[PDB]
Structure 1
Amino acid sequence: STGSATTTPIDSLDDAYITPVQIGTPAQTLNLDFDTGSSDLWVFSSETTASEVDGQTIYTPSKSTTAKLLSGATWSISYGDGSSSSGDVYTDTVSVGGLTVTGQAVESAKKVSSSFTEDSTIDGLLGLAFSTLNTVSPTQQKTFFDNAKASLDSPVFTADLGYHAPGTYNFGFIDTTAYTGSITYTAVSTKQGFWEWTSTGYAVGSGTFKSTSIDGIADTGTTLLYLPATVVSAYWAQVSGAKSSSSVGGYVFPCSATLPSFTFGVGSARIVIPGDYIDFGPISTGSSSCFGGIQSSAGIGINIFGDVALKAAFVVFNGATTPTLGFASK
């Protein structure tokens, strides 16, 4: 089997991407944030505290003839951005772009933190990291990809995120029309539960490539590119007036600037992020200070190849017995 679904930016900055997902019988369609940095499929629901729901579409398990309470199971998750959610668990039928999994754990939120309530466009998350990170207790549950893998034509999914435009998540096949050149594959460590890999270096604009190993994660659920402070300083030093602002929480730059591109290495290959992809607009409405799309990872503990990086590439998440990642230009 295969599946193919379009993913759409939630706003004009590409702060996140939502993908329609069918849950239950008859289908209830919710727009979920596909997140290769986590491993829970959770949804706003009929059980979510009413004051914490503000415009989202909810899953109502009592209206699904295939929903079954997973007795005794609870879940609770906290994300790197400080947000969180928790609740109980049903199993139900879940379909993405024509690919159907029966018995998928659908984690129903009883509580969500303020940032989720405040984002009316995201109805939940669909985790695509390794199932060892799934938070369901006392019986850990598998991701949608893990449940579907055996049935797929090939045990892979691909992320093709658009810049200020829709893109595609495919399951079970590699669309050879969606990229240019060849796909360069690189080794993955699953030791932390992430799609964790080592970039071979970077360049800023037209500058020379610096060969240096950068361990990080391919994370569709993170908006920006988070890299070591040395790398980030080298980037922003090429933008007149750019500075790190503690009060804003990262590098900002004059909105009048033309940003240089940023290149990252995948083995001997190179992925070029155009400068425009690094502009996240005014820090506040009307400001002439703009927020940068490349930021320091120094306070995280891990480097994150988030959407800013991934959207410049066609990315293969290869879930073979030994997982690997593939990157192609497009």
Structure 2
Amino acid sequence: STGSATTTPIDSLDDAYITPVQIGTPAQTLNLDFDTGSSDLWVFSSETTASEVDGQTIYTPSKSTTAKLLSGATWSISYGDGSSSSGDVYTDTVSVGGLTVTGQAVESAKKVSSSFTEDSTIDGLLGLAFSTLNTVSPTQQKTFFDNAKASLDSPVFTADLGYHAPGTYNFGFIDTTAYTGSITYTAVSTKQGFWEWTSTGYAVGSGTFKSTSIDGIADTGTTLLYLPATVVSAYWAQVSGAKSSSSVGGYVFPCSATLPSFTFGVGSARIVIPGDYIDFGPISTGSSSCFGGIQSSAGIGINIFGDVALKAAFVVFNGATTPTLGFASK
């Protein structure tokens, strides 16, 4: 089997992407944030504290003839950005782009943090990291991909995120029309439960390539590119007037700037992030200070190849017995 679904930016900045997901019988379609940095499929629901729901579409398990309470199971998650959610668990039928999993754990939120409430466009998350990170207790649950894998034509999914435009998540096949040149594959460590890999270096603009190993995670659920402070300083040094602002929470730059590109290495291959991808707009409405899309990972404890990086590539998440990651230009 295969699946193919369009993923759509939630706003003009590509702050996140939402993908429609069918849950239950009859289908209830919710727009979920596909997150290769976590491993829980959780939704706003009829059980979510009413004051914490503000415009989201909810899953109502009592209206699904295929829903079953997973008795005794609870979940609770906290994300790198400080947001969180928790609740109980149902199993139900879940379909993405025509690919169906029966008995998928659907984690129903009883509580969500303010950041989730305040974002009316995201109805929940669909985790695509390794199932070892799933938070369901006392019986850990499998991700949608893990459940689908054996049925797929090939045990893979691909992320093709657009810049200021829709893109595609495919399951079970590689669309050879969706990228240019060849796909370069690179080793993955699953030891921390992430799609963790090592970039071979970087360049700023038309500058020379610096060969240096940068360990990090491919994370579709993180907006920005978080890299070591040395790398980030080298990038912003090429933008007149750019500075790190403790008050704002990262590098800012004059909105009048033209940003240089940023290149990262994948083996001997190179992925170029155009300068425009690195612009996250005014820090507040009407400001001439703009927020940068490349930020320091210092104090996160891990480098993160978030959407800023991934949307410059066609990315293969290869879930074979020994997982790997593939990157192509597009």
Q: TM-score range by the shorter chain?
A: over 0.9
CA deviations over 1:212-238 (Å, ceiling 9, x no partner)? 000000000000000000000000000
Aligned equivalents of 1:184, 1:321: Cα separation in 2:
18
1:49 match = 49
Aligned equivalents of 1:60, 1:191: Cα separation in 2:
36
Secondary structure, counterpart of 1:105 in structure 2: strand
How far has the Cα of 1:254 moved from its partner? 0.1
How far has the Cα of 1:69 moved from its partner? 0.0
Aligned equivalents of 2:79, 2:275: Cα separation in 1:
28
How far has the Cα of 1:299 moved from its partner? 1.3
Aligned equivalents of 1:19, 1:206: Cα separation in 2:
35
Aligned equivalents of 1:292, 1:141: Cα separation in 2:
37
Aligned equivalents of 2:256, 2:327: Cα separation in 1:
32
CA deviations over 1:174-232 (Å, ceiling 9, x no partner)? 00000000000000000000000000000000000000000000000000000000000
How far has the Cα of 1:107 moved from its partner? 0.0
How far has the Cα of 1:109 moved from its partner? 0.1
TM-score normalised to structure 1 length:
1.00
1:136 match = 136
How far has the Cα of 1:74 moved from its partner? 0.1
How far has the Cα of 1:127 moved from its partner? 0.0
How far has the Cα of 1:300 moved from its partner? 0.1
Aligned equivalents of 1:83, 1:299: Cα separation in 2:
17
1:22 aligned onto 2:26:
no
Aligned equivalents of 2:98, 2:299: Cα separation in 1:
40
How far has the Cα of 1:248 moved from its partner? 0.1
Aligned equivalents of 1:206, 1:107: Cα separation in 2:
47
Secondary structure, counterpart of 2:110 in structure 1: strand
> Structure 1 segments of 4 or more deviating over 3 A?
none
1:83 match = 83
Aligned equivalents of 1:255, 1:324: Cα separation in 2:
38
CA deviations over 1:43-81 (Å, ceiling 9, x no partner)? 000000000000000000000000000000000000000
Aligned equivalents of 1:305, 1:97: Cα separation in 2:
25
The alignment covers a number of residue pairs equal to 330
Aligned equivalents of 1:43, 1:191: Cα separation in 2:
27
Aligned equivalents of 1:221, 1:11: Cα separation in 2:
15
CA deviations over 1:302-327 (Å, ceiling 9, x no partner)? 00000000000000000000000000
Structure 1 unmatched ranges of 5 or more: none
Aligned equivalents of 1:224, 1:79: Cα separation in 2:
15
CA deviations over 1:223-274 (Å, ceiling 9, x no partner)? 0000000000000000000000000000000000000000000000000000
Aligned equivalents of 2:105, 2:279: Cα separation in 1:
37
Aligned equivalents of 1:100, 1:19: Cα separation in 2:
15
Aligned equivalents of 1:323, 1:258: Cα separation in 2:
38
How far has the Cα of 1:145 moved from its partner? 0.0
Aligned equivalents of 1:237, 1:138: Cα separation in 2:
49
Secondary structure, counterpart of 1:150 in structure 2: helix
Aligned equivalents of 2:115, 2:228: Cα separation in 1:
26
Secondary structure, counterpart of 2:206 in structure 1: coil
Aligned equivalents of 1:220, 1:88: Cα separation in 2:
25
CA deviations over 1:117-161 (Å, ceiling 9, x no partner)? 000000000000000000000000000000000000000000000
Secondary structure, counterpart of 2:151 in structure 1: coil
Aligned equivalents of 1:300, 1:202: Cα separation in 2:
20
Q: CA RMSD in A?
A: 0.1
Report sequence identity in percent.
100
Secondary structure, counterpart of 1:276 in structure 2: helix
Aligned equivalents of 2:203, 2:72: Cα separation in 1:
51
Secondary structure, counterpart of 2:146 in structure 1: helix
Aligned equivalents of 1:13, 1:68: Cα separation in 2:
38
How far has the Cα of 1:103 moved from its partner? 0.1
How far has the Cα of 1:276 moved from its partner? 0.1
Secondary structure, counterpart of 2:147 in structure 1: helix
Aligned equivalents of 2:322, 2:33: Cα separation in 1:
26
Aligned equivalents of 1:280, 1:255: Cα separation in 2:
10
1:223 match = 223
Secondary structure, counterpart of 1:252 in structure 2: strand
Aligned equivalents of 1:63, 1:6: Cα separation in 2:
26
Aligned equivalents of 1:23, 1:193: Cα separation in 2:
26
Secondary structure, counterpart of 1:234 in structure 2: helix
Aligned equivalents of 2:220, 2:12: Cα separation in 1:
17
Secondary structure, counterpart of 2:70 in structure 1: strand
2:118 match = 118
